[PDB]
Amino acid sequence: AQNPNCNIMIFHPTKEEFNDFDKYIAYMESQGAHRAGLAKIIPPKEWKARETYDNISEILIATPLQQVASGRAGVFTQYHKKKKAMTVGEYRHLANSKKYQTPPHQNFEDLERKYWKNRIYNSPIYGADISGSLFDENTKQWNLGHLGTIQDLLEKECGVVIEGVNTPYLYFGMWKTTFAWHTEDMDLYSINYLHLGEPKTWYVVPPEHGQRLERLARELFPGSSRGCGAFLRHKVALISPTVLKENGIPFNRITQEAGEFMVTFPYGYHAGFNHGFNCAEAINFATPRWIDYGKMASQCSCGEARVTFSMDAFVRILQPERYDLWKRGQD
Ligand SMILES: O=C(O)CNC(=O)C(=O)O
Ligand SMILES: [Mg+2]
Ligand code: NI
Ligand SMILES: [Zn+2]
Q1: Quick check: CB of 190 below 6 Å from ligand 1?
Q2: What is the distance between the alpha carbons of residues 88 and 95, in angstroms, rounded to a whole number?
Q3: What is the dihedral of CA 128, 213, 183, 17, to 10 degrees?
Q4: Which of 66, 81, 84, 195 stands the most exposed, by the fewest C-beta atoms within 10 Å?
């Protein structure tokens, strides 16, 4: 079995190997990459997402989210407080202000220490989940706006035609902006490209150990757990690496830099934070190997997690028994 310790693997495809996305994902998996839950892909040196980032300031962040924490430094929840719209130019200026900028630090490890020590005492503003793309339409390889759709994958594997579309989303981050512990909707893959700016640190639990994370989370967030059998779908819970180590949860960590892709694999729990002003683009995707995970994915039926139009059909076809109860939560 390849990669039995479930280490995060880093790939360096040639421009020739960068031509066929599906085939490269399948290659990564042949090397055991999926066992970690997360892989890094460094694009060939000849590749570019677009020519420059000089003209992005007039993108609108219609609902910036202020991430307010509660709890203790290692174990906290965050809620998202809606703020007034601002442009990317305005947001970048805010990220760089004295109140929100990245503090002096030695290296990534020192900054990680400062994040976990100090995250809860600040409320950074996140521009999340903005429909759109920063890939040039002439970028042919690994253009997240041109991937095959999850609906076409389900049709090709299962023969059923369903409604829904699949488009990318932009994330504008600042120091301390945080992604809580989660798997993707319907335990899909995700791909994330860091277009510009400061790095993003990731933590991930191997898929084969996801239930160990879930068990800890139910112990650490006992009221949330009673309210909903899949509360990590709410994307509000944070658990530090120190706490995971104290509780013997297997995990790994890696820092993504501008110009690098990360791939999350089905049922790979992940969480992380941004180092400073940045812009990432991400999209969910599927492969044949996803199907069985989609069939077994937990669902939030308490009504908090409130998810896309396209998830309907996935639950309807892959999880017909759940459908009824899940749609009662979604309506
Ligand atoms: O970039 C972020 O804030 C979080 N991204 C993801 O969880 C992802 O790409 O799966
Ligand atoms: Mg613009
Ligand atoms: Ni994710
Ligand atoms: Zn729920």
Answers
A1: yes
A2: 10
A3: 110
A4: 84
| Token couple for 119 | 């995250």
Of 322, 22, 313, give the one whose Cα is nearest residue 155.
313
Beta-carbon contacts of residue 314 (< 8 Å; ≥ 6 apart): 150, 154, 162, 164, 185, 186, 294
300 labelled as ligand-binding?
yes
Task: Count CB atoms within 10 A of the CB of residue 104.
Answer: 8
Helix (H, G, I), strand (E, B) or coil at 325: helix
**Helices 309-318 & 320-329 angle (0-180, nearest 10):** 150
Please state at what angle helix 309-318 crosses helix 150-158, rounded to 10 degrees: 20
Backbone Cα Rg of the chain: 19
Phi and psi based region of residue 139 (left: phi greater than 0; alpha: psi -120 to 50; beta: remaining): beta
Mutating to test ligand 1, I would choose from 125, 126, 171 the residue with most ligand atoms within 8 A of its C-beta, which is 171
Q: What φ, ψ does residue 212 adopt, rounded to 5°?
A: -70, -40
Q: Do 283 and 191 form a contact (C-beta atoms < 8 A)?
A: yes
Distance CA 263, CA 230 (A): 23
Q: Please, what sign has the CA dihedral across residues 183, 76, 112, 253?
A: negative
Q: Which of 325, 295, 300, 330 is nearest to 312 (CA)?
A: 330
220 Cα: distance to centroid of ligand 1 (angstroms): 23
Domains and CATH numbers, the chain: 1-331 (2.60.120.650)
Write out the DSSP string of 176-187.
T-EEEEE--GGG
Which helix (H) or strand (E) segment is 309 a member of? helix 309-318
Closest residue by CA, ligand 1 atom 4: 179
Question: End-to-end CA distance of the chain, in Å?
Answer: 44
